[PDB]
Amino acid sequence: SLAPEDGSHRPAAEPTPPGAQPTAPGSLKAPDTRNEKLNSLEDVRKGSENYALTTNQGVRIADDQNSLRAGSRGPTLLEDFILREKITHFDHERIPERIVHARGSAAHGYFQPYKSLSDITKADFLSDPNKITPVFVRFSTVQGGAGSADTVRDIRGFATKFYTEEGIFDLVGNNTPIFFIQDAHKFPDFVHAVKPEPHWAIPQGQSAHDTFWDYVSLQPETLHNVMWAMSDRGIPRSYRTMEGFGIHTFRLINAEGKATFVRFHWKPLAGKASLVWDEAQKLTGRDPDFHRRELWEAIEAGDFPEYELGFQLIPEEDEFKFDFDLLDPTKLIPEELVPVQRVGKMVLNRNPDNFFAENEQAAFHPGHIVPGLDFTNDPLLQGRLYSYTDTQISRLGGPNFHEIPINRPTCPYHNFQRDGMHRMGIDTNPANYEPNSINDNWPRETPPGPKRGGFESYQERVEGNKVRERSPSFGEYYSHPRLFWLSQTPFEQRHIVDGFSFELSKVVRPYIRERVVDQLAHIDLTLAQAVAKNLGIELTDDQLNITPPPDVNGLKKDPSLSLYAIPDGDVKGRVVAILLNDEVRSADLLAILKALKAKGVHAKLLYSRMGEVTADDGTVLPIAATFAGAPSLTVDAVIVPCGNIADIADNGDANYYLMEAYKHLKPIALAGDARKFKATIKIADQGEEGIVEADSADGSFMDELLTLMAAHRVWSRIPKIDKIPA
Amino acid sequence: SLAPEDGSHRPAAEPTPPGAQPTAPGSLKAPDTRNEKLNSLEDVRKGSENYALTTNQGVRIADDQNSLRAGSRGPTLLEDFILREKITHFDHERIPERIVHARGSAAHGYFQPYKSLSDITKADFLSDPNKITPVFVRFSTVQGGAGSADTVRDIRGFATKFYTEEGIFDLVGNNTPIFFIQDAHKFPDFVHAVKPEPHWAIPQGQSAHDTFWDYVSLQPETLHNVMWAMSDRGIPRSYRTMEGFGIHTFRLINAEGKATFVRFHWKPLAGKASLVWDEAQKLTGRDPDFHRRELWEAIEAGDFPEYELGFQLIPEEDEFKFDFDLLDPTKLIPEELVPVQRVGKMVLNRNPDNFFAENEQAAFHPGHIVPGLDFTNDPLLQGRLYSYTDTQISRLGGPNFHEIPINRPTCPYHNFQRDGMHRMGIDTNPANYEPNSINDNWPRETPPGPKRGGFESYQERVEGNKVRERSPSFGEYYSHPRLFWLSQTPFEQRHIVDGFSFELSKVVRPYIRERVVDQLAHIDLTLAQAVAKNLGIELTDDQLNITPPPDVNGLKKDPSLSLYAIPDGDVKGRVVAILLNDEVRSADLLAILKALKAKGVHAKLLYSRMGEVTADDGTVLPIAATFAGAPSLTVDAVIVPCGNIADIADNGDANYYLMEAYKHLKPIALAGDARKFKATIKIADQGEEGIVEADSADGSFMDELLTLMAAHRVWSRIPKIDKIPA
Ligand code: HEM
Ligand code: HEM
């Protein structure tokens, strides 16, 4: 009996706010959250309580503390089969990480369509609003290893496996609506250029290095996705507050055989929100697991990540009606021109039990489609269909990776494939080929049909010669970067300029910085000049005279491209730091905590040490963390209640807490004598927008602070933070 | 797409200071630096200039930009063998990382002994002062993955492969002189407890979590290496500035057959130096590759890492003469009792060409010894002998990992082993077994003898029954942690208190924190009480009455256990930031640069933008990085020359640069009007030890700064930094 007699070693099996209880495997934290795929995993879930410790052959172990030796100070003997199994298994724990998207975090959930889409697709999972499909979703970064940090500047992966009654459909997307390159043949060049450089393997998690910008400078097709990565889209606040996209145009095929082109979207029901660069970069040091942690904790709290699936639909006859090619994955389809139709809702409501078994071994591949969907000739999508099965062979050990529990379909699967490493299923069919008579030809082919039919490709006409040639329709590189740029707010544009400037300052060969500046001058002169100024580079008269690229189908902006132009803020699931002192005014703390609770906003009570402190009325306040232990980077807002403020007024960490929160544009609220901290952040007597202050935390104080939180950050403070040494 | 006309894309093939040129593969940067191992790798080095791009089968590629398609907008065709081989290789790039020590950085070098050691060992590499042995060295952290950060708090590995004339000897050590556990049977339990927890795979690179401290609190044999890890030993400034240790007692065997017990040491000739916690932790965010980069750039600059090999020698008859067991790897041998005898010097003088081929695929294993060395019954060493060969099998793909070029011996190797995956060597021997007559029994066994003999084990007497039992002599856990504690300076003790306090504050289950504090009360009550105060824990009367453990053979302290108690500072290879303004006083900059050059200290010129600034005399100064881009974290001291100080006096980043440097105890020097920055670091006008100030920079000003840098950090400022908001 090593557990404490009070039972405090075990978290409650009930939703609890982040930090209230230790985190736990999903099936222990939320045993009653169920779906068909989670139930199907029961056959392989292993418990532990009340069982004897054994070898893998079932032999009970008596002494798991010592090797067998000749004398208690003697040599270790070869006959210790128990030691040898334990060390052998440990020595072989690791498998190869994914080639890209090696860092990621995953959860279980379920999807349901709002209405039947039988008019446009015969896909079974979109046929009935009462049909619930289990999902497993993995979010990721792209460049860094599995041990790299979460809040880097990067594209994010958003991969969803739908366990449908007609097969697994994997929608393997990212958080921006285009990709960097046009033809899969370039993918190993692009990935090699962004990954750490080959002589020394630096830098991890960063595109701020020479070979990335060298490639970009030489391949202008990259500039569109580079604009999105340099914007605040490249540093999301959470996986819950970013958009998802399939990027490619795919087809939907209905029961009559009509094809409609489709791009897929996910809309975050929590709203779009990003960090600012200095915060993101410092957070990769103070908590390199911040997004993984925040996802798991949201789920444990009941703040389930919700997303709405949407389709952009274009009829077959309108394939050539835009200024860009629908098959070019470096071009987006502006929502001003083709709106997103809402199709269904996905809720992620349970964490895995074991990260290696379920997240690390999961295998998503965009070739995994079902009847009712089909591909197009997008030349990046076409090359993807080669890569995902082959790689999963070396990563996961052989051709039976579909039998790893998390990858298994929940529907029937039968065929004539046999053997391979790690073969689990024991086939009893007398035949392993077709056609056969010895088993009456079963399992049998199934003709295509409106429901439960075999897959048939749409009969698209192909015409042309065998060529290695880029379509001329793909040779336009600057109009969509310009559309993105003109769609951003003025503070979003400043942050783009700063992304480019910071990244190019890390490029050691100055001529590459110059070449990138020249590319920027083909997109927008204001952007090029402001980056050039930060780099100490002067545009030439030729560069000042480059004519801007044309508008996209007559658009000079599209506000759906901005994170912030259209308010969509949601405070539920956010977190506020409450900076305590050793005699807090309990009235302020009751008002603050209960207002946050009512809006589903979490609180962390911080102090200069761990333990407890005692409020004015004798209430015992438990401390979650110290000021340095849970820095302002990890919260959305900071509130300082009244009490004995002299206790913390000269505490450097408490003062810095506010200076850092202030620099990073977060709302700050100061009650009572906590308003003495106004001097630390240089706030004027009459106050300023973004700082809430009053004599007590009562009346409208918490409503004002929550209004600031719904707007995410205090953009109007940006000119004010430029000075301030923090 | 070519190179710039001026040749500025290619680094000069001569030693240059960090940042002066882009870094490059070692064979290109230093083509004249040779040793027998580096030359032997010439068979597999692949150039590139002037060569055609080809497939791996030698077919020249005409178009490496496009997949083969049926029409330029059509589907990709299966018959594109060029696309398929490029994508297939890419899809299989990754191999499993090492189970532990996955994050590491390596270089080539050479070793030679100071004098023949033939009276104590017959090992050929120690037999002649003019016989040089090539080495390859990898330094590592322990817990984090290969993409995790460098300046985490962790033990560091220090593994050296010696390519001797009588076989490869791998000395696989760490940077503290003991390990956490006594018997290899517990290694998978310990490693699992420190590694990310299994449900959610958090946290990376950190022991600051429940499972690690649960294990420590239940296994007090861990407390000695925990003390080391919580001290500033856990956060080295560079791999150049830490000690190494083989940990285990091994044997030396001379030509007469006499065995002497030995422990191995490496002494850094650059001296011992560590970061401070807040600096280390923020640097994991601002530069997660800091130690890898620093090592590479020291070798490029000619600041070659040098280390002295040292042996603590104990005769066989003195095995039981201490109050601890020599075979217990949780016990150190104090140098007050057994001096370290200097044996030789190692110099690392060339970087690899390709990180994956040389660093990632290197295989070190402590079972790789040579005649003249032998093992002992240390029960941790005994179990390591099982694990290194077996793991290198799944990691490196098969039993022929010795034929991977970095792992090959440079001496002859011939035997009857055959086949296995990726077999390179083509054996011509008609026999693959012995004894054989058909090849006259070649290759033949070789009797042992004084030189060039076959390996024979020392004939140690073994007497005991077959037991799984820990030796009673190993059951003492508190005396060595106490000796360590008492040998640290008062500031180093403060940092150990802070390291335990910070870590246990992140343990969510409070009882585990209480159980660790109870263990600390068995080591030293001052330590226990200082940690308990930061955790809001009160010691019980019983805990206040625990009797301290005994002294270690009469010692009350051993100063060789401290990083700083005995001055050993060497400024060559350190780096200063120079904060420029737009009209630098060129006389100051002249004096600064001349004094730094004389001592081998590098400079980095920083400003608020990139490009160039011009000094008062017309000198054009290229800017290495912005104040934000290369923070104070990355330098050893900060100097601010005069000039137009108004240009930077109100820059928030410039002021914060000094505040962070001040909080981190770094020397700061201010000339002329730069003294106005004294106000931001909120202290004295008469001056303060640690801040060098004068009307101009010159001989006396630079001398004073350089003396500060030789002492590493300004420990006297510690009490003044808790008030600074930084
Ligand atoms: C629209 C462009 C692309 C998007 C949105 C995309 C998305 C993703 C995502 C989200 C993952 C990680 C799935 C996971 O969480 O396990 C992934 C993995 C991968 N991608 Fe793609 N990708 C794209 C382009 C490509 C191209 C052109 C290729 C190669 C031809 C490729 C090869 C791979 C490979 C090798 C993996 C690792 C898969 C595995 O080990 O399971 N990707 N990609
Ligand atoms: C004194 C205690 C120990 C020290 C000093 C030690 C040192 C190290 C070092 C420095 C490396 C990294 C070598 C490299 O750079 O590639 C390493 C790797 C390894 N160690 Fe140890 N270790 C110790 C105990 C153990 C134990 C008790 C075991 C297992 C029984 C063990 C198993 C491993 C394995 C599996 C690797 C990965 C090796 C590879 O993939 O090539 N270590 N160790």
PDB file of C-alpha atoms in Angstrom, chain A residues 548-705:
ATOM      1  CA  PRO A 548       0.489  44.907 -58.694  1.00  0.00           C
ATOM      2  CA  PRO A 549      -1.097  41.639 -59.711  1.00  0.00           C
ATOM      3  CA  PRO A 550      -4.741  41.650 -60.741  1.00  0.00           C
ATOM      4  CA  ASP A 551      -7.653  41.231 -58.308  1.00  0.00           C
ATOM      5  CA  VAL A 552      -9.146  37.746 -57.997  1.00  0.00           C
ATOM      6  CA  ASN A 553     -12.417  37.658 -59.955  1.00  0.00           C
ATOM      7  CA  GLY A 554     -12.873  41.291 -59.114  1.00  0.00           C
ATOM      8  CA  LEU A 555     -12.271  41.026 -55.384  1.00  0.00           C
ATOM      9  CA  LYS A 556      -9.960  43.407 -53.596  1.00  0.00           C
ATOM     10  CA  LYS A 557     -10.638  41.777 -50.240  1.00  0.00           C
ATOM     11  CA  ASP A 558     -12.451  38.936 -48.575  1.00  0.00           C
ATOM     12  CA  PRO A 559     -12.995  39.258 -44.865  1.00  0.00           C
ATOM     13  CA  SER A 560     -13.326  35.558 -44.291  1.00  0.00           C
ATOM     14  CA  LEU A 561      -9.528  35.463 -44.833  1.00  0.00           C
ATOM     15  CA  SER A 562      -8.922  37.521 -41.651  1.00  0.00           C
ATOM     16  CA  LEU A 563      -8.805  35.960 -38.132  1.00  0.00           C
ATOM     17  CA  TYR A 564     -10.327  38.995 -36.518  1.00  0.00           C
ATOM     18  CA  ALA A 565     -12.077  41.270 -39.048  1.00  0.00           C
ATOM     19  CA  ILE A 566     -15.552  39.705 -38.204  1.00  0.00           C
ATOM     20  CA  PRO A 567     -15.995  39.201 -34.419  1.00  0.00           C
ATOM     21  CA  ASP A 568     -16.563  35.488 -33.550  1.00  0.00           C
ATOM     22  CA  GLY A 569     -15.148  35.397 -29.982  1.00  0.00           C
ATOM     23  CA  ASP A 570     -16.224  32.794 -27.340  1.00  0.00           C
ATOM     24  CA  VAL A 571     -14.883  32.887 -23.797  1.00  0.00           C
ATOM     25  CA  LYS A 572     -15.895  29.394 -22.671  1.00  0.00           C
ATOM     26  CA  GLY A 573     -12.768  27.292 -22.066  1.00  0.00           C
ATOM     27  CA  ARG A 574     -10.454  30.298 -21.688  1.00  0.00           C
ATOM     28  CA  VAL A 575      -8.409  30.800 -18.493  1.00  0.00           C
ATOM     29  CA  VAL A 576      -7.640  33.820 -16.289  1.00  0.00           C
ATOM     30  CA  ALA A 577      -4.733  34.218 -13.836  1.00  0.00           C
ATOM     31  CA  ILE A 578      -5.749  35.611 -10.448  1.00  0.00           C
ATOM     32  CA  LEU A 579      -2.770  37.058  -8.648  1.00  0.00           C
ATOM     33  CA  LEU A 580      -3.349  36.541  -4.885  1.00  0.00           C
ATOM     34  CA  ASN A 581      -1.813  38.286  -1.899  1.00  0.00           C
ATOM     35  CA  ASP A 582      -1.610  37.058   1.768  1.00  0.00           C
ATOM     36  CA  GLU A 583      -4.862  38.811   2.795  1.00  0.00           C
ATOM     37  CA  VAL A 584      -7.164  38.815  -0.217  1.00  0.00           C
ATOM     38  CA  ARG A 585     -10.395  40.697  -0.078  1.00  0.00           C
ATOM     39  CA  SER A 586     -12.810  37.677  -0.107  1.00  0.00           C
ATOM     40  CA  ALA A 587     -15.729  39.744  -1.490  1.00  0.00           C
ATOM     41  CA  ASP A 588     -13.677  40.573  -4.639  1.00  0.00           C
ATOM     42  CA  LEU A 589     -12.645  36.918  -5.028  1.00  0.00           C
ATOM     43  CA  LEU A 590     -16.264  35.591  -4.673  1.00  0.00           C
ATOM     44  CA  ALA A 591     -17.511  38.022  -7.339  1.00  0.00           C
ATOM     45  CA  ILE A 592     -14.585  37.223  -9.667  1.00  0.00           C
ATOM     46  CA  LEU A 593     -14.741  33.454  -9.380  1.00  0.00           C
ATOM     47  CA  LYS A 594     -18.453  33.145  -9.688  1.00  0.00           C
ATOM     48  CA  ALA A 595     -18.606  35.460 -12.762  1.00  0.00           C
ATOM     49  CA  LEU A 596     -15.966  33.390 -14.513  1.00  0.00           C
ATOM     50  CA  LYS A 597     -17.752  30.109 -13.592  1.00  0.00           C
ATOM     51  CA  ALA A 598     -21.008  31.375 -15.058  1.00  0.00           C
ATOM     52  CA  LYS A 599     -19.308  31.916 -18.473  1.00  0.00           C
ATOM     53  CA  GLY A 600     -17.297  28.714 -18.339  1.00  0.00           C
ATOM     54  CA  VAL A 601     -14.030  30.574 -17.910  1.00  0.00           C
ATOM     55  CA  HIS A 602     -11.419  28.890 -15.774  1.00  0.00           C
ATOM     56  CA  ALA A 603      -9.278  30.462 -13.132  1.00  0.00           C
ATOM     57  CA  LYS A 604      -5.792  29.731 -11.769  1.00  0.00           C
ATOM     58  CA  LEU A 605      -4.993  31.238  -8.360  1.00  0.00           C
ATOM     59  CA  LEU A 606      -1.290  32.263  -8.276  1.00  0.00           C
ATOM     60  CA  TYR A 607       1.067  33.314  -5.496  1.00  0.00           C
ATOM     61  CA  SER A 608       4.757  33.604  -4.644  1.00  0.00           C
ATOM     62  CA  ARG A 609       4.905  30.097  -3.131  1.00  0.00           C
ATOM     63  CA  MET A 610       2.750  26.970  -3.151  1.00  0.00           C
ATOM     64  CA  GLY A 611       0.383  25.931  -0.290  1.00  0.00           C
ATOM     65  CA  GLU A 612      -2.499  27.974   0.925  1.00  0.00           C
ATOM     66  CA  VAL A 613      -3.158  31.536   1.799  1.00  0.00           C
ATOM     67  CA  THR A 614      -5.899  32.919   4.100  1.00  0.00           C
ATOM     68  CA  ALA A 615      -8.384  35.537   2.901  1.00  0.00           C
ATOM     69  CA  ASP A 616      -9.558  38.504   5.116  1.00  0.00           C
ATOM     70  CA  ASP A 617     -12.642  36.552   6.244  1.00  0.00           C
ATOM     71  CA  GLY A 618     -10.596  33.400   7.061  1.00  0.00           C
ATOM     72  CA  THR A 619     -11.364  31.530   3.843  1.00  0.00           C
ATOM     73  CA  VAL A 620      -8.475  29.117   2.983  1.00  0.00           C
ATOM     74  CA  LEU A 621      -7.388  29.672  -0.696  1.00  0.00           C
ATOM     75  CA  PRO A 622      -5.339  26.808  -2.326  1.00  0.00           C
ATOM     76  CA  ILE A 623      -2.616  27.988  -4.717  1.00  0.00           C
ATOM     77  CA  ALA A 624      -2.385  26.412  -8.182  1.00  0.00           C
ATOM     78  CA  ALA A 625       1.016  27.674  -9.149  1.00  0.00           C
ATOM     79  CA  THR A 626       3.642  30.401  -8.520  1.00  0.00           C
ATOM     80  CA  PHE A 627       3.932  33.520 -10.637  1.00  0.00           C
ATOM     81  CA  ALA A 628       7.039  32.022 -12.405  1.00  0.00           C
ATOM     82  CA  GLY A 629       5.578  28.575 -12.493  1.00  0.00           C
ATOM     83  CA  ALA A 630       2.474  29.477 -14.565  1.00  0.00           C
ATOM     84  CA  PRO A 631       3.519  32.613 -16.459  1.00  0.00           C
ATOM     85  CA  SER A 632       1.125  35.002 -18.131  1.00  0.00           C
ATOM     86  CA  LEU A 633       1.879  33.295 -21.442  1.00  0.00           C
ATOM     87  CA  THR A 634      -0.429  30.469 -20.386  1.00  0.00           C
ATOM     88  CA  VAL A 635      -3.530  32.577 -19.688  1.00  0.00           C
ATOM     89  CA  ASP A 636      -5.942  34.793 -21.591  1.00  0.00           C
ATOM     90  CA  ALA A 637      -6.344  37.631 -19.025  1.00  0.00           C
ATOM     91  CA  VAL A 638      -5.053  38.689 -15.599  1.00  0.00           C
ATOM     92  CA  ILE A 639      -7.145  39.881 -12.593  1.00  0.00           C
ATOM     93  CA  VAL A 640      -5.641  41.255  -9.391  1.00  0.00           C
ATOM     94  CA  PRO A 641      -8.170  41.390  -6.434  1.00  0.00           C
ATOM     95  CA  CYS A 642      -7.686  43.834  -3.539  1.00  0.00           C
ATOM     96  CA  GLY A 643      -6.271  42.810  -0.119  1.00  0.00           C
ATOM     97  CA  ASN A 644      -2.751  43.348   1.263  1.00  0.00           C
ATOM     98  CA  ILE A 645      -1.207  44.545  -1.988  1.00  0.00           C
ATOM     99  CA  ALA A 646       2.032  45.619  -0.210  1.00  0.00           C
ATOM    100  CA  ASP A 647       2.674  41.796  -0.022  1.00  0.00           C
ATOM    101  CA  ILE A 648       3.258  41.531  -3.794  1.00  0.00           C
ATOM    102  CA  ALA A 649       3.767  45.136  -4.957  1.00  0.00           C
ATOM    103  CA  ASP A 650       7.577  44.893  -4.859  1.00  0.00           C
ATOM    104  CA  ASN A 651       7.663  41.235  -6.018  1.00  0.00           C
ATOM    105  CA  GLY A 652       9.523  41.346  -9.344  1.00  0.00           C
ATOM    106  CA  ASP A 653       7.740  38.271 -10.667  1.00  0.00           C
ATOM    107  CA  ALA A 654       4.266  39.737  -9.947  1.00  0.00           C
ATOM    108  CA  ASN A 655       5.162  43.043 -11.557  1.00  0.00           C
ATOM    109  CA  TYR A 656       6.691  41.224 -14.565  1.00  0.00           C
ATOM    110  CA  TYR A 657       3.570  39.041 -14.796  1.00  0.00           C
ATOM    111  CA  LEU A 658       1.566  42.163 -15.604  1.00  0.00           C
ATOM    112  CA  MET A 659       4.185  43.654 -17.890  1.00  0.00           C
ATOM    113  CA  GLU A 660       4.286  40.493 -19.971  1.00  0.00           C
ATOM    114  CA  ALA A 661       0.477  40.223 -20.086  1.00  0.00           C
ATOM    115  CA  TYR A 662       0.301  43.897 -21.044  1.00  0.00           C
ATOM    116  CA  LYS A 663       2.918  43.559 -23.881  1.00  0.00           C
ATOM    117  CA  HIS A 664       1.025  40.563 -25.269  1.00  0.00           C
ATOM    118  CA  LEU A 665      -2.226  42.599 -25.460  1.00  0.00           C
ATOM    119  CA  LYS A 666      -4.190  40.674 -22.827  1.00  0.00           C
ATOM    120  CA  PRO A 667      -6.996  42.281 -20.774  1.00  0.00           C
ATOM    121  CA  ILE A 668      -5.982  43.113 -17.291  1.00  0.00           C
ATOM    122  CA  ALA A 669      -8.361  43.986 -14.386  1.00  0.00           C
ATOM    123  CA  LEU A 670      -7.300  45.643 -11.176  1.00  0.00           C
ATOM    124  CA  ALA A 671      -9.569  46.051  -8.125  1.00  0.00           C
ATOM    125  CA  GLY A 672      -9.161  48.304  -5.140  1.00  0.00           C
ATOM    126  CA  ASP A 673      -5.539  48.881  -4.094  1.00  0.00           C
ATOM    127  CA  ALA A 674      -4.380  46.573  -6.939  1.00  0.00           C
ATOM    128  CA  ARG A 675      -4.690  49.711  -9.014  1.00  0.00           C
ATOM    129  CA  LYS A 676      -1.221  50.550  -7.543  1.00  0.00           C
ATOM    130  CA  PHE A 677       0.079  48.291 -10.309  1.00  0.00           C
ATOM    131  CA  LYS A 678      -1.016  50.889 -12.904  1.00  0.00           C
ATOM    132  CA  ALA A 679       2.435  52.480 -12.428  1.00  0.00           C
ATOM    133  CA  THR A 680       4.241  49.304 -13.363  1.00  0.00           C
ATOM    134  CA  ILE A 681       2.487  49.260 -16.788  1.00  0.00           C
ATOM    135  CA  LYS A 682       2.462  53.103 -16.997  1.00  0.00           C
ATOM    136  CA  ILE A 683      -1.380  53.458 -17.142  1.00  0.00           C
ATOM    137  CA  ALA A 684      -2.664  57.044 -16.819  1.00  0.00           C
ATOM    138  CA  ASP A 685      -4.982  58.284 -13.997  1.00  0.00           C
ATOM    139  CA  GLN A 686      -8.034  58.433 -16.203  1.00  0.00           C
ATOM    140  CA  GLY A 687      -7.352  54.787 -17.300  1.00  0.00           C
ATOM    141  CA  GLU A 688      -7.173  53.365 -20.822  1.00  0.00           C
ATOM    142  CA  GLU A 689      -9.164  50.900 -23.001  1.00  0.00           C
ATOM    143  CA  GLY A 690      -8.179  47.334 -22.199  1.00  0.00           C
ATOM    144  CA  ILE A 691      -7.522  47.833 -18.495  1.00  0.00           C
ATOM    145  CA  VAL A 692     -10.514  47.328 -16.199  1.00  0.00           C
ATOM    146  CA  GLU A 693     -10.259  49.186 -12.874  1.00  0.00           C
ATOM    147  CA  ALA A 694     -12.645  49.958 -10.061  1.00  0.00           C
ATOM    148  CA  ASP A 695     -12.867  50.205  -6.264  1.00  0.00           C
ATOM    149  CA  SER A 696     -14.215  46.623  -6.031  1.00  0.00           C
ATOM    150  CA  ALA A 697     -14.719  43.619  -8.328  1.00  0.00           C
ATOM    151  CA  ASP A 698     -18.496  44.169  -8.031  1.00  0.00           C
ATOM    152  CA  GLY A 699     -21.061  45.828 -10.331  1.00  0.00           C
ATOM    153  CA  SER A 700     -19.884  46.009 -13.909  1.00  0.00           C
ATOM    154  CA  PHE A 701     -16.165  45.092 -13.368  1.00  0.00           C
ATOM    155  CA  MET A 702     -16.447  41.411 -14.339  1.00  0.00           C
ATOM    156  CA  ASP A 703     -18.819  42.170 -17.219  1.00  0.00           C
ATOM    157  CA  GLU A 704     -16.293  44.633 -18.639  1.00  0.00           C
ATOM    158  CA  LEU A 705     -13.418  42.180 -18.266  1.00  0.00           C
TER     159      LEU A 705
END
